Amino acid sequence: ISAFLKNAWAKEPVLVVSFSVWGLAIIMPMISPYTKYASMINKATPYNYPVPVRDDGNMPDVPSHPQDPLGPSLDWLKNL
């Protein structure tokens, strides 16, 4: 088969490159460790208002202020 791939790389290299790039496009996402960050970024963007919630008095995990150290931090995106 190597000889076939070789004579194609010599004769019709455009299709060789096409299939190779097809495969790499399909593969590299499965390979990279920076793939998970795409959705995380597209989720971090506040295209809408962060509607606040009523302080029922049972929301310990939720902050009372933006600069209150609670909630999702964006450091992973500030140093990426």
Binding site: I41, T45, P46, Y47
Partner: protein
């Protein structure tokens, strides 16, 4: 290079949008108050 530049652009977008967030309450108050004013004027004139 494009990766890095687009990441910094995303961050700058976060910044702009956070500013918009901080300002939306004022704009909402003004818009509501102004719509009510316009409607009350149109009501007075619909009464005349």
């Amino acid at each position: 290079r494009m990766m890095r530049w687009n990441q910094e652009r995303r961050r700058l977008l976060i910044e702009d949008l956070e500013a918009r967030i901080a300002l939306m309450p004022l704009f909402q108050a003004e818009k509501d108050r102004r719509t009510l004013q316009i409607l009350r004027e149109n009501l007075e004139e619909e009464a005349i």
